[PDB]
Amino acid sequence: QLDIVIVLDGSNSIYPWDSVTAFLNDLLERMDIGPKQTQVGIVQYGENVTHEFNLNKYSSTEEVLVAAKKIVQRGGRQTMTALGTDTARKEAFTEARGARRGVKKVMVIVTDGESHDNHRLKKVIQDCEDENIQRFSIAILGSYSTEKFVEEIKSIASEPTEKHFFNVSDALALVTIVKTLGERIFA
Ligand SMILES: [Mg+2]
Please report the resolution in angstroms.
1.9
Question: Helices (H) and strands (E) in the chain — how many of each?
Answer: 7, 6
Domains and CATH numbers, the chain: 1-187 (3.40.50.410)
- Rg for the chain (alpha carbons), in Å? 15
Cα dihedral 42, 105, 82, 87 in deg (nearest 10): 60
CA of 47 relative to ligand 1 center, distance in Å: 10
DSSP 16-39: -HHHHHHHHHHHHTTS-BSTTSEE
- How many angstroms does the Cα of residue 156 sit away from the middle of ligand 1? 17
CA of 152 to the centre of ligand 1 (A): 15
Separation of CA 143 and ligand 1 centre (Å) = 9
Ligand 1 centre distance from Cα of residue 70 (Å):
21
* 97 within 8 A of 124, measured Cβ to Cβ: no
Q: Are the C-beta atoms of 157 and 138 separated by less than 8 Å?
A: no
CA of 9 to the centre of ligand 1 (A): 7
Rounded to an integer, what distance in angstroms lies between the CA atom of residue 82 and that of residue 45? 10
Enumerate residues 6+ apart whose C-beta is below 8 A from 102: none
What is the rounded CA–CA span in Å between residue 84 and residue 113? 13
How crowded is the C-beta side of 155, counted as CA atoms within 13 Å? 18
Query: 114: CA distance to ligand 1 center in Å?
Result: 9
Contact by Cβ (8 Å): 74, 44: yes
